Structure formats: structure tokens, C-alpha cells
Amino acid sequence: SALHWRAAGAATVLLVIVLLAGSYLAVLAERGAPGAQLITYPRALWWSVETATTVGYGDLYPVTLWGRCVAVVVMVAGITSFGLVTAALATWFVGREQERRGH
Amino acid sequence: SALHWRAAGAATVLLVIVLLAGSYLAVLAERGAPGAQLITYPRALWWSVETATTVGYGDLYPVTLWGRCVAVVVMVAGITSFGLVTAALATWFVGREQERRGH
Amino acid sequence: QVQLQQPGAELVKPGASVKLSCKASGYTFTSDWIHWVKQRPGHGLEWIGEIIPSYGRANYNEKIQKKATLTADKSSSTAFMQLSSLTSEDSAVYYCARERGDGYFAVWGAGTTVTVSSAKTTPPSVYPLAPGSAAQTNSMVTLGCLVKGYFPEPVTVTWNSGSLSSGVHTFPAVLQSDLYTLSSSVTVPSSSWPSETVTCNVAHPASSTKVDKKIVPRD
Amino acid sequence: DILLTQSPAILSVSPGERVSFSCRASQSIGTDIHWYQQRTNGSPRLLIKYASESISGIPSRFSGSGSGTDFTLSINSVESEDIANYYCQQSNRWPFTFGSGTKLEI
Amino acid sequence: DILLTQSPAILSVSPGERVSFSCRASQSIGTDIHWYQQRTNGSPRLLIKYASESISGIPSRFSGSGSGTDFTLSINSVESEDIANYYCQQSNRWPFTFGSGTKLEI
Ligand SMILES: CCCCCCCCCCCC(=O)OC[C@H](CO)OC(=O)CCCCCCCC
Ligand SMILES: CCCCCCCCCCCC(=O)OC[C@H](CO)OC(=O)CCCCCCCC
Ligand SMILES: CCCC[N+](CCCC)(CCCC)CCCC
Ligand SMILES: CCCCCCCCCO
Ligand SMILES: CCCCCCCCCO
């Protein structure tokens, strides 16, 4: 088992973690702020997913300071995790291209 | 034909696939939910495209559990496919830089 | 050709249930949705529900009491709508329509007239209606035919097997003592009648009867 | 659920006049409105789709316009064969819905 | 804060009739509306959640519909045991809120 593949897995596990913790923390942070919509777990989990992937439709988003802070962690964990997979794929292509180079 | 280029192609073919299946499955999942807008194929295909690329304007998005699940696959297939192209380009640059290094 | 075929009528006793059918033709894509629409006499169009045959999934107008259950037979391209435990409020014309999954109903069936009642089916009596001997005619003559004493209700009247369309109009039926009655009128140039034959065709879907009646001058 | 209001339920015009049918939606629905014609004892027939797109086999006399919440079905130069009921239908959100309809009278 | 308007505060119907309760929101709230029944001296009881989802242990007689700003709680074939107060509640935005309620009368 290579580091990049182990890193991919780990990245995926930690991301699913951030998503769950993030969903829980967003609701905890938004309830109390009038006009807030990120206030029930099911949709918060949906919000966290569309945030980690950067799709951000705009149907949901935090309006409080703590919610936004939670949002930042989720964005970063998502961007960074997916970028990690990209780097793992680059390593896999490079390694095989060297082989095919008989190097 | 190098693996990364073959992988790029395959990634592109599978993505066009996910887009089509996704468009079909989203409509199938959203019809039945009052207030839903992702309910006709033509625009669903448009929705799937803007989801796979992460642009997500917000003019359309699923509101049901199954729609969101479909949405997740499309997001992942898009992010991952494009990242795969990026890694293929990195391999191409590295391979040539080694040549230019006369290594 | 007719893209959606629906039976003309169905008589149903209160409490009982019926299963309407809608056979389809023409192009059929996996993205097709078959819809059902209810129209009470006088009222407008009411959406009942839909079904996508290629998957069998069905959704219903949650705004109204769920009287229907939609199913489809992929092999014989037929959609079915089961209405159960009906009342007089369920009496109406039920249409099926095809939507290519792009929002609009490109094509509709002729619709099945459903009548909820304890009465019994009764085919109509078709009598001719030719002018009397002392009736003077002008450049035109008016003939007709009386369709009386029938149940459920649609009756489709045509003239000369449908070849005579101009100068025609059938009156709405009137209900009396559990039997409907109406008359249809036809008007052709006075020179062409007796000479050229004039016949009225009466199809009564509920009783599977279709009768003719040539209109000849009175003795 | 989207409510579709068809104003005067009845419209009277003289032969040849241009006539306009109104359809208003309870909320903004883009251009996802369609029009049907239903003659006495006939089944509905699509006339205009997506607010203003022509349908093959429909007299050039017919046209539609609008977007958002206000829609219009127009018949340039009315004639006897146009005597019927006119309905609008929306496909923007789910419960597809129909307007109550407008009867044309000459 | 979201305002919930429950129209006629009182509704009179004959035994067996179908009855419909209205709930209107000051702004669009999707399908995030819930209905409760409260009999004389009893505590509230969930009947419908998310506008139209059935709750286990509730007579099939009860159903809900709508989305956006207009919601309806329907009772097909009213009966004595249904005599009570009916309230709607929204969970779309924060201050969850209740409607003023509608009393059913037979
Ligand atoms: C605290 C951590 C987060 C836990 C969230 C709760 C579990 C998740 C769904 C429960 C479903 C439910 O009862 O609701 C379906 C809903 C129900 O009608 O709306 C829905 O639309 C929720 C969709 C969520 C999609 C998430 C996709 C993630 C890849
Ligand atoms: C000029 C450079 C930018 C400086 C901006 C000011 C400092 C930042 C926050 C101050 C908080 C405040 O008094 O307000 C909390 C607010 C207060 O009720 O609303 C809020 O919702 C603001 C949330 C901002 C989240 C930023 C996340 C960045 C990773
Ligand atoms: C296929 C869409 C990719 C969108 N990205 C990656 C999102 C990964 C969840 C946005 C990065 C934002 C820092 C890449 C830039 C796209 C212009
Ligand atoms: C990274 C710190 C956790 C996010 C902030 C949580 C605030 C909880 C209290 O309101
Ligand atoms: C990955 C599973 C497919 C997405 C869910 C489809 C649900 C279809 C039924 O409603």
C-alpha cells in the first residue's frame, strides 16, 4: 500500500468526518439567529456536502460568525481532500510513465 | 497510447455517462416533491453539467434525499474527472521536463 | 395515427371500482410520462397523477383524495389507472396524455366517460326524422335522427359514416327518469337528398352497440 | 403548488378582431407555460408551448408572449373555428397545474 | 420572523364532509410546515409533517398539501373525534413559529 493511496483513503475518511461534525456544528451555530435556514441536520448535511465540493447552489448558507467559521473548515477540508486525490492520481500516472520509459 | 491519456478519455466518457444517467435519475427522484424544479430532462441535463463542473448557479438543485444523492455522485464524478485531466497534464509536463533534462 | 387509445365509457356502481386503459402508439422513449386528467362536466382540467413506464414510478396530485392507482404494461405499451370505491363526484371524463418529459402534453386520448350510478346500461332507440308532406323546402333541407332512452351517456352521432360533416350539430342530451335523449340535425342542399343517401350512425360505447338509420322521405 | 389565474372566464370579440387571453401565475415561472384549445366535446390540443413557441400544424394566427408571472395567448383575426375553451398549464415546479380556462365567444 | 396565518379561525362542516384547513406563510418556506391536533384539555399531537408526510398512527383520513406559502390540512369525511383545534408550524427559518389555529366544528 503506497502513501498516496493511503493518503487518499485517510483524506476521504477525515472529510466524511468534517462533513458530519460540520453539519452538527452549523445547526448549533445558526439556531438563535433570526432568518437563519441552516437549522436542521438533514439539510445541514446536504449544505456541508455542497460546500465541501464548492458547488454552493445558494439554497443554504450560514449567516452567523460561527457558522461561517464552520463553513470555512468544510470548504478547506473539501478543496484540500479532492486536491489530494488529484495528486495521488498524478503520482500514479508518473510512476507508470517512468516504467513505460523503462527507467 | 499512455495510461494517463487513456485515463483522461475514459474519465471523459464515464463523465458524459454520469451526466446523462444523472439527468434521468434526478427527474425521476424530484417529481413527486412539491416545489421541485429539477423535473424535466433538458434542464436536468443542464443542472447536471453545472453540478459536475461545480459552477452551481442556483437556478436549479434537488430538494429530495434521492436527488441530493444523485447530485453527490455527479459532483464527485465531475471534480474527480477534471482532476484526472489535471494529473494527466502534470505527467505530460514532468515527462518532457525530464527529457529536456537529458535524464 | 391515433397515439393514445382510450375506451369511450365505463359505468360503475357506487363503492365499486374500474380500471381504465390507455394504449399508445407512435414513438416511445424511456423518458415518456403518461398523465391522467379528470374533467367533470362544465368544470376544467384537473391533474390526477403521472407514471413513467420505463421505471414504473408514479406520483399523484396530493391536493385531492387519492382515488387512483397507476400502473403500466411495458410489453403492450398500455397505461392503467385504477379508480376505487367511487361516488357520483367521481363521474367525469378521464383523459390520458403523453409528455416527453419536457413539461407539456403533446398528445391526449379521446377520454373515457365514467358514470357512477346504480342504474343499468341501456342502448338507444334511433328514429329517423324526415319532414312532413306539407313542409315546403328551400335551397336546403333539414333532416335528423332521434337518439332516445340510453344510459351512461356518451353516444357519438355521425352522418354518412362521418363523410357528411358540414351542416351538422348534435344537441346535448337531457336526462329524465334515468334515461338520456338527444337529437342530431343535418342539412344538405334540397336537390341532393332522397337522390343521394343520408344516414345517421349512432355508437353507444357503454353497450358496445353501433346502429344506422337511413333517412328517407315519409310515405 | 402554483396557482394559475385565467382572468375573464369569458371573452367576447367581433369576427376578425385580435383577441388576447390572460394567464397569471402565483409566482415567477420563467417561460414554462403552455396553452391548450378544447372545443365542445373534444379533447385538449396543444397550441403553444413554452409561452411563445409555435407548434406544427397550428394556424399562424396563434401566438403567445410573456414570462415570469404574466402570460398571453393571442389570436390575430378571430374566426368561428376558434370558438372554444383555452387553458394554460405550468411545468416549472411540481404539481404541474392548469388554469381554470377562458371561453372564447364571437 | 415568519408569520403563519390560519384563515377562518372556525370551520363548520356536516358529518362525513371533506374539510380543508388553510395555513399561509408570510414568505416562501418550501415544504417545512407541520400540523398538530389539540383536543379540549389535551396536549398537541403531530398529524402531518413536511406539508404532506403521513405520521404513523394517524387515521388515513388526514392528509396535507401545498408548498411555498399556501398549505392545506384535509380531513376526508369528518367525524366527532376530529373536533379540536388545528395548528400549523414552520421550521424553515429561525424563530420556529405557530399559526393562530383553526377550530373544527361539526
Ligand atoms: C448530524 C450529521 C448529519 C446527519 C443528517 C441526517 C441523516 C441524513 C439524511 C436523513 C434523511 C431524512 O430523514 O430526511 C430526508 C428529508 C426527510 O424527508 O430531507 C432531505 O432532502 C435530506 C437530504 C440529505 C442528503 C445528504 C447527502 C450526503 C452525501
Ligand atoms: C477589512 C478586513 C476584513 C475585516 C472584517 C472584520 C473582522 C471579522 C469578523 C468580525 C466579526 C463581527 O464583529 O461581526 C460579527 C457579525 C457581528 O454580529 O457578522 C458575521 O457573520 C461576520 C462573519 C465573518 C466570517 C469571516 C470568516 C473568515 C475566514
Ligand atoms: C470541476 C469544478 C472544480 C472547482 N474547483 C475545485 C472544487 C473542488 C471541490 C474549485 C476550487 C476552488 C478553490 C476548481 C476550480 C474550478 C474553476
Ligand atoms: C473550529 C471551531 C469550531 C467552530 C465554532 C463552533 C461554535 C460553537 C458555539 O456557538
Ligand atoms: C446511487 C443510487 C442511485 C440514486 C438514487 C435513485 C433513487 C431512485 C428512486 O426514487
PDB file of C-alpha atoms in Angstrom, chain C:
ATOM      1  CA  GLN C   1     -52.315   7.562 -36.394  1.00  0.00           C
ATOM      2  CA  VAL C   2     -54.073   7.931 -33.033  1.00  0.00           C
ATOM      3  CA  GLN C   3     -51.272   7.997 -30.469  1.00  0.00           C
ATOM      4  CA  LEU C   4     -53.435   7.221 -27.393  1.00  0.00           C
ATOM      5  CA  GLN C   5     -56.462   4.879 -27.397  1.00  0.00           C
ATOM      6  CA  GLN C   6     -58.999   5.037 -24.565  1.00  0.00           C
ATOM      7  CA  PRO C   7     -62.363   3.238 -24.213  1.00  0.00           C
ATOM      8  CA  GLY C   8     -65.361   5.553 -24.686  1.00  0.00           C
ATOM      9  CA  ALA C   9     -67.175   4.704 -21.462  1.00  0.00           C
ATOM     10  CA  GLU C  10     -67.395   2.835 -18.183  1.00  0.00           C
ATOM     11  CA  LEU C  11     -70.444   2.503 -15.943  1.00  0.00           C
ATOM     12  CA  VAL C  12     -69.647   1.914 -12.268  1.00  0.00           C
ATOM     13  CA  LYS C  13     -71.790   1.284  -9.180  1.00  0.00           C
ATOM     14  CA  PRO C  14     -71.076   3.459  -6.139  1.00  0.00           C
ATOM     15  CA  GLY C  15     -68.488   1.759  -3.974  1.00  0.00           C
ATOM     16  CA  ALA C  16     -67.244  -0.391  -6.846  1.00  0.00           C
ATOM     17  CA  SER C  17     -64.117   0.280  -8.894  1.00  0.00           C
ATOM     18  CA  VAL C  18     -62.940   0.333 -12.515  1.00  0.00           C
ATOM     19  CA  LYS C  19     -59.611   0.132 -14.329  1.00  0.00           C
ATOM     20  CA  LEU C  20     -59.268   2.473 -17.302  1.00  0.00           C
ATOM     21  CA  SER C  21     -56.762   1.744 -20.055  1.00  0.00           C
ATOM     22  CA  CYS C  22     -54.764   3.917 -22.464  1.00  0.00           C
ATOM     23  CA  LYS C  23     -52.985   2.098 -25.300  1.00  0.00           C
ATOM     24  CA  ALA C  24     -50.239   4.081 -27.015  1.00  0.00           C
ATOM     25  CA  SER C  25     -48.540   4.167 -30.419  1.00  0.00           C
ATOM     26  CA  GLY C  26     -46.023   6.265 -32.298  1.00  0.00           C
ATOM     27  CA  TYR C  27     -42.588   6.933 -30.815  1.00  0.00           C
ATOM     28  CA  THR C  28     -41.991   5.731 -27.257  1.00  0.00           C
ATOM     29  CA  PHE C  29     -38.927   6.938 -25.346  1.00  0.00           C
ATOM     30  CA  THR C  30     -37.793   5.813 -21.887  1.00  0.00           C
ATOM     31  CA  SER C  31     -38.319   9.439 -20.919  1.00  0.00           C
ATOM     32  CA  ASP C  32     -42.067   9.352 -21.593  1.00  0.00           C
ATOM     33  CA  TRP C  33     -44.534  10.067 -18.803  1.00  0.00           C
ATOM     34  CA  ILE C  34     -48.197   9.149 -19.103  1.00  0.00           C
ATOM     35  CA  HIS C  35     -50.540  11.539 -17.308  1.00  0.00           C
ATOM     36  CA  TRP C  36     -54.192  11.283 -16.352  1.00  0.00           C
ATOM     37  CA  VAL C  37     -56.525  14.270 -16.199  1.00  0.00           C
ATOM     38  CA  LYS C  38     -60.045  14.499 -14.787  1.00  0.00           C
ATOM     39  CA  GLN C  39     -62.772  16.744 -16.216  1.00  0.00           C
ATOM     40  CA  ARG C  40     -66.206  16.969 -14.576  1.00  0.00           C
ATOM     41  CA  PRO C  41     -68.953  18.222 -16.919  1.00  0.00           C
ATOM     42  CA  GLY C  42     -68.764  22.005 -17.059  1.00  0.00           C
ATOM     43  CA  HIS C  43     -65.583  22.192 -14.944  1.00  0.00           C
ATOM     44  CA  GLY C  44     -61.980  22.425 -16.088  1.00  0.00           C
ATOM     45  CA  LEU C  45     -58.934  20.183 -16.247  1.00  0.00           C
ATOM     46  CA  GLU C  46     -57.684  18.566 -13.055  1.00  0.00           C
ATOM     47  CA  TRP C  47     -54.351  16.761 -12.864  1.00  0.00           C
ATOM     48  CA  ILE C  48     -54.585  13.342 -11.194  1.00  0.00           C
ATOM     49  CA  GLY C  49     -51.115  11.879 -11.435  1.00  0.00           C
ATOM     50  CA  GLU C  50     -48.408  10.524 -13.671  1.00  0.00           C
ATOM     51  CA  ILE C  51     -46.344   7.445 -14.337  1.00  0.00           C
ATOM     52  CA  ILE C  52     -43.101   6.735 -16.141  1.00  0.00           C
ATOM     53  CA  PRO C  53     -43.495   3.230 -17.680  1.00  0.00           C
ATOM     54  CA  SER C  54     -39.767   2.614 -18.257  1.00  0.00           C
ATOM     55  CA  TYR C  55     -39.377   2.576 -14.465  1.00  0.00           C
ATOM     56  CA  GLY C  56     -42.952   2.255 -13.214  1.00  0.00           C
ATOM     57  CA  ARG C  57     -42.637   5.097 -10.702  1.00  0.00           C
ATOM     58  CA  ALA C  58     -45.857   7.040 -10.063  1.00  0.00           C
ATOM     59  CA  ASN C  59     -46.786  10.365  -8.419  1.00  0.00           C
ATOM     60  CA  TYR C  60     -50.230  11.732  -7.515  1.00  0.00           C
ATOM     61  CA  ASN C  61     -51.961  15.075  -7.121  1.00  0.00           C
ATOM     62  CA  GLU C  62     -51.678  15.216  -3.347  1.00  0.00           C
ATOM     63  CA  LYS C  63     -54.186  18.081  -3.400  1.00  0.00           C
ATOM     64  CA  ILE C  64     -57.087  15.625  -3.854  1.00  0.00           C
ATOM     65  CA  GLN C  65     -58.355  12.386  -2.284  1.00  0.00           C
ATOM     66  CA  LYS C  66     -56.338   9.524  -3.776  1.00  0.00           C
ATOM     67  CA  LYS C  67     -58.878   7.531  -5.790  1.00  0.00           C
ATOM     68  CA  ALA C  68     -56.370   6.333  -8.406  1.00  0.00           C
ATOM     69  CA  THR C  69     -53.527   3.834  -8.680  1.00  0.00           C
ATOM     70  CA  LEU C  70     -51.377   3.970 -11.805  1.00  0.00           C
ATOM     71  CA  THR C  71     -49.572   1.040 -13.402  1.00  0.00           C
ATOM     72  CA  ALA C  72     -48.204   0.274 -16.846  1.00  0.00           C
ATOM     73  CA  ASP C  73     -47.504  -2.721 -19.069  1.00  0.00           C
ATOM     74  CA  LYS C  74     -44.259  -2.057 -20.914  1.00  0.00           C
ATOM     75  CA  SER C  75     -44.813  -5.036 -23.238  1.00  0.00           C
ATOM     76  CA  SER C  76     -48.166  -3.853 -24.636  1.00  0.00           C
ATOM     77  CA  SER C  77     -47.497  -0.122 -24.263  1.00  0.00           C
ATOM     78  CA  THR C  78     -50.591   0.283 -22.104  1.00  0.00           C
ATOM     79  CA  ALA C  79     -51.059   2.512 -19.065  1.00  0.00           C
ATOM     80  CA  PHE C  80     -53.747   1.700 -16.494  1.00  0.00           C
ATOM     81  CA  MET C  81     -55.494   3.837 -13.901  1.00  0.00           C
ATOM     82  CA  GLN C  82     -57.482   2.043 -11.225  1.00  0.00           C
ATOM     83  CA  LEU C  83     -60.192   4.149  -9.595  1.00  0.00           C
ATOM     84  CA  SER C  84     -61.611   2.554  -6.436  1.00  0.00           C
ATOM     85  CA  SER C  85     -64.749   2.951  -4.305  1.00  0.00           C
ATOM     86  CA  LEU C  86     -66.303   5.672  -6.443  1.00  0.00           C
ATOM     87  CA  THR C  87     -69.156   8.109  -5.824  1.00  0.00           C
ATOM     88  CA  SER C  88     -71.108  10.461  -8.109  1.00  0.00           C
ATOM     89  CA  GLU C  89     -68.330  13.000  -7.557  1.00  0.00           C
ATOM     90  CA  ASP C  90     -66.070  10.627  -9.477  1.00  0.00           C
ATOM     91  CA  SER C  91     -68.295  10.788 -12.577  1.00  0.00           C
ATOM     92  CA  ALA C  92     -66.423  12.580 -15.350  1.00  0.00           C
ATOM     93  CA  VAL C  93     -64.335  12.319 -18.465  1.00  0.00           C
ATOM     94  CA  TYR C  94     -60.880  10.874 -17.728  1.00  0.00           C
ATOM     95  CA  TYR C  95     -58.108  11.684 -20.187  1.00  0.00           C
ATOM     96  CA  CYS C  96     -54.635  10.243 -20.585  1.00  0.00           C
ATOM     97  CA  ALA C  97     -51.860  12.317 -22.143  1.00  0.00           C
ATOM     98  CA  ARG C  98     -48.258  11.763 -23.120  1.00  0.00           C
ATOM     99  CA  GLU C  99     -45.463  14.081 -22.048  1.00  0.00           C
ATOM    100  CA  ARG C 100     -41.961  13.583 -23.418  1.00  0.00           C
ATOM    101  CA  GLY C 101     -40.570  14.643 -20.052  1.00  0.00           C
ATOM    102  CA  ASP C 102     -40.336  18.258 -21.133  1.00  0.00           C
ATOM    103  CA  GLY C 103     -43.397  19.646 -19.368  1.00  0.00           C
ATOM    104  CA  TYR C 104     -46.181  19.807 -21.942  1.00  0.00           C
ATOM    105  CA  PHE C 105     -48.876  17.364 -23.023  1.00  0.00           C
ATOM    106  CA  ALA C 106     -48.112  16.849 -26.699  1.00  0.00           C
ATOM    107  CA  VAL C 107     -50.952  14.400 -27.179  1.00  0.00           C
ATOM    108  CA  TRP C 108     -54.239  13.432 -25.494  1.00  0.00           C
ATOM    109  CA  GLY C 109     -56.560  10.456 -25.621  1.00  0.00           C
ATOM    110  CA  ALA C 110     -60.211  10.849 -26.571  1.00  0.00           C
ATOM    111  CA  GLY C 111     -61.001  10.243 -22.922  1.00  0.00           C
ATOM    112  CA  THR C 112     -63.172   7.706 -21.136  1.00  0.00           C
ATOM    113  CA  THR C 113     -66.560   8.874 -19.859  1.00  0.00           C
ATOM    114  CA  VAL C 114     -67.080   7.417 -16.397  1.00  0.00           C
ATOM    115  CA  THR C 115     -70.530   7.438 -14.848  1.00  0.00           C
ATOM    116  CA  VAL C 116     -71.085   6.344 -11.258  1.00  0.00           C
ATOM    117  CA  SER C 117     -74.661   5.134 -10.809  1.00  0.00           C
ATOM    118  CA  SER C 118     -76.816   2.190  -9.715  1.00  0.00           C
ATOM    119  CA  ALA C 119     -78.831   2.264 -12.941  1.00  0.00           C
ATOM    120  CA  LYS C 120     -78.333  -0.173 -15.807  1.00  0.00           C
ATOM    121  CA  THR C 121     -76.903   0.099 -19.287  1.00  0.00           C
ATOM    122  CA  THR C 122     -79.499   0.730 -21.979  1.00  0.00           C
ATOM    123  CA  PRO C 123     -78.760   1.123 -25.687  1.00  0.00           C
ATOM    124  CA  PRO C 124     -80.659   3.897 -27.508  1.00  0.00           C
ATOM    125  CA  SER C 125     -83.523   3.750 -29.996  1.00  0.00           C
ATOM    126  CA  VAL C 126     -82.703   5.684 -33.161  1.00  0.00           C
ATOM    127  CA  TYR C 127     -85.709   7.052 -35.028  1.00  0.00           C
ATOM    128  CA  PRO C 128     -85.490   8.932 -38.331  1.00  0.00           C
ATOM    129  CA  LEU C 129     -86.748  12.483 -38.701  1.00  0.00           C
ATOM    130  CA  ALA C 130     -87.864  13.467 -42.179  1.00  0.00           C
ATOM    131  CA  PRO C 131     -90.115  16.484 -42.916  1.00  0.00           C
ATOM    132  CA  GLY C 132     -93.871  16.132 -43.253  1.00  0.00           C
ATOM    133  CA  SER C 133     -95.708  16.260 -46.592  1.00  0.00           C
ATOM    134  CA  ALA C 134     -96.828  19.897 -46.256  1.00  0.00           C
ATOM    135  CA  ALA C 135     -93.376  21.243 -45.406  1.00  0.00           C
ATOM    136  CA  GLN C 136     -92.009  23.410 -48.218  1.00  0.00           C
ATOM    137  CA  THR C 137     -88.240  23.277 -48.734  1.00  0.00           C
ATOM    138  CA  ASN C 138     -85.784  25.977 -49.797  1.00  0.00           C
ATOM    139  CA  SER C 139     -82.353  25.564 -51.430  1.00  0.00           C
ATOM    140  CA  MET C 140     -81.662  23.379 -48.395  1.00  0.00           C
ATOM    141  CA  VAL C 141     -83.445  20.650 -46.452  1.00  0.00           C
ATOM    142  CA  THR C 142     -83.071  19.652 -42.801  1.00  0.00           C
ATOM    143  CA  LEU C 143     -83.170  16.059 -41.623  1.00  0.00           C
ATOM    144  CA  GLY C 144     -82.256  14.471 -38.319  1.00  0.00           C
ATOM    145  CA  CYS C 145     -82.466  11.447 -36.082  1.00  0.00           C
ATOM    146  CA  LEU C 146     -83.716  10.931 -32.501  1.00  0.00           C
ATOM    147  CA  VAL C 147     -81.437   9.022 -30.134  1.00  0.00           C
ATOM    148  CA  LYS C 148     -83.621   8.170 -27.146  1.00  0.00           C
ATOM    149  CA  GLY C 149     -83.589   6.119 -23.951  1.00  0.00           C
ATOM    150  CA  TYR C 150     -79.907   5.259 -23.299  1.00  0.00           C
ATOM    151  CA  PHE C 151     -77.722   5.130 -20.134  1.00  0.00           C
ATOM    152  CA  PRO C 152     -74.118   6.020 -19.018  1.00  0.00           C
ATOM    153  CA  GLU C 153     -74.035   8.621 -21.678  1.00  0.00           C
ATOM    154  CA  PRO C 154     -71.723   9.311 -24.492  1.00  0.00           C
ATOM    155  CA  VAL C 155     -73.279   8.455 -27.845  1.00  0.00           C
ATOM    156  CA  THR C 156     -71.368   9.550 -30.941  1.00  0.00           C
ATOM    157  CA  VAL C 157     -73.551  10.523 -33.878  1.00  0.00           C
ATOM    158  CA  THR C 158     -72.128  10.793 -37.376  1.00  0.00           C
ATOM    159  CA  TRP C 159     -73.758  11.257 -40.765  1.00  0.00           C
ATOM    160  CA  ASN C 160     -72.906   9.051 -43.747  1.00  0.00           C
ATOM    161  CA  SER C 161     -70.260   7.259 -41.705  1.00  0.00           C
ATOM    162  CA  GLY C 162     -68.540  10.562 -40.999  1.00  0.00           C
ATOM    163  CA  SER C 163     -68.357  11.719 -44.631  1.00  0.00           C
ATOM    164  CA  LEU C 164     -71.044  14.348 -44.028  1.00  0.00           C
ATOM    165  CA  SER C 165     -69.655  16.887 -41.555  1.00  0.00           C
ATOM    166  CA  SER C 166     -70.866  20.284 -42.734  1.00  0.00           C
ATOM    167  CA  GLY C 167     -74.330  21.450 -41.742  1.00  0.00           C
ATOM    168  CA  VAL C 168     -74.360  19.172 -38.718  1.00  0.00           C
ATOM    169  CA  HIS C 169     -74.902  19.654 -34.991  1.00  0.00           C
ATOM    170  CA  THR C 170     -75.923  17.270 -32.235  1.00  0.00           C
ATOM    171  CA  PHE C 171     -77.746  18.640 -29.199  1.00  0.00           C
ATOM    172  CA  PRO C 172     -76.632  17.941 -25.595  1.00  0.00           C
ATOM    173  CA  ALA C 173     -78.627  15.079 -24.061  1.00  0.00           C
ATOM    174  CA  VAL C 174     -81.357  15.614 -21.452  1.00  0.00           C
ATOM    175  CA  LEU C 175     -81.808  13.244 -18.533  1.00  0.00           C
ATOM    176  CA  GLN C 176     -85.226  12.035 -17.473  1.00  0.00           C
ATOM    177  CA  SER C 177     -86.167   9.047 -15.315  1.00  0.00           C
ATOM    178  CA  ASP C 178     -82.688   7.514 -15.656  1.00  0.00           C
ATOM    179  CA  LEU C 179     -82.515   7.629 -19.465  1.00  0.00           C
ATOM    180  CA  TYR C 180     -80.853  10.165 -21.764  1.00  0.00           C
ATOM    181  CA  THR C 181     -82.257  11.515 -25.020  1.00  0.00           C
ATOM    182  CA  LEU C 182     -80.975  13.829 -27.737  1.00  0.00           C
ATOM    183  CA  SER C 183     -81.357  14.572 -31.429  1.00  0.00           C
ATOM    184  CA  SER C 184     -78.860  15.314 -34.166  1.00  0.00           C
ATOM    185  CA  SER C 185     -79.533  17.548 -37.162  1.00  0.00           C
ATOM    186  CA  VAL C 186     -78.100  17.548 -40.672  1.00  0.00           C
ATOM    187  CA  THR C 187     -78.648  19.951 -43.542  1.00  0.00           C
ATOM    188  CA  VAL C 188     -77.898  19.282 -47.212  1.00  0.00           C
ATOM    189  CA  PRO C 189     -78.898  21.093 -50.417  1.00  0.00           C
ATOM    190  CA  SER C 190     -82.546  20.229 -51.098  1.00  0.00           C
ATOM    191  CA  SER C 191     -81.696  18.862 -54.554  1.00  0.00           C
ATOM    192  CA  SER C 192     -79.338  16.230 -53.165  1.00  0.00           C
ATOM    193  CA  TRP C 193     -81.313  14.411 -50.533  1.00  0.00           C
ATOM    194  CA  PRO C 194     -83.557  11.407 -51.441  1.00  0.00           C
ATOM    195  CA  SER C 195     -81.368  11.108 -54.519  1.00  0.00           C
ATOM    196  CA  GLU C 196     -78.143  10.881 -52.514  1.00  0.00           C
ATOM    197  CA  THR C 197     -78.470   8.753 -49.388  1.00  0.00           C
ATOM    198  CA  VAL C 198     -78.307  10.314 -45.899  1.00  0.00           C
ATOM    199  CA  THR C 199     -77.737   8.070 -42.872  1.00  0.00           C
ATOM    200  CA  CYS C 200     -77.045   8.648 -39.201  1.00  0.00           C
ATOM    201  CA  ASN C 201     -74.673   6.369 -37.275  1.00  0.00           C
ATOM    202  CA  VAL C 202     -75.073   6.004 -33.538  1.00  0.00           C
ATOM    203  CA  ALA C 203     -72.372   4.337 -31.472  1.00  0.00           C
ATOM    204  CA  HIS C 204     -73.156   3.710 -27.807  1.00  0.00           C
ATOM    205  CA  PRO C 205     -69.807   2.678 -26.194  1.00  0.00           C
ATOM    206  CA  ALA C 206     -71.257   1.509 -22.864  1.00  0.00           C
ATOM    207  CA  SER C 207     -73.379  -1.128 -24.596  1.00  0.00           C
ATOM    208  CA  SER C 208     -70.956  -1.894 -27.440  1.00  0.00           C
ATOM    209  CA  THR C 209     -73.697  -1.023 -29.924  1.00  0.00           C
ATOM    210  CA  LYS C 210     -73.459   0.976 -33.138  1.00  0.00           C
ATOM    211  CA  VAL C 211     -76.561   1.387 -35.261  1.00  0.00           C
ATOM    212  CA  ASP C 212     -77.525   3.002 -38.541  1.00  0.00           C
ATOM    213  CA  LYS C 213     -80.714   4.610 -39.799  1.00  0.00           C
ATOM    214  CA  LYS C 214     -81.229   5.834 -43.343  1.00  0.00           C
ATOM    215  CA  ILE C 215     -83.406   8.924 -43.607  1.00  0.00           C
ATOM    216  CA  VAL C 216     -85.902   8.529 -46.427  1.00  0.00           C
ATOM    217  CA  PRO C 217     -88.887  10.733 -47.270  1.00  0.00           C
ATOM    218  CA  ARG C 218     -92.117   9.982 -45.412  1.00  0.00           C
ATOM    219  CA  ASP C 219     -94.522   7.644 -47.252  1.00  0.00           C
TER     220      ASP C 219
END
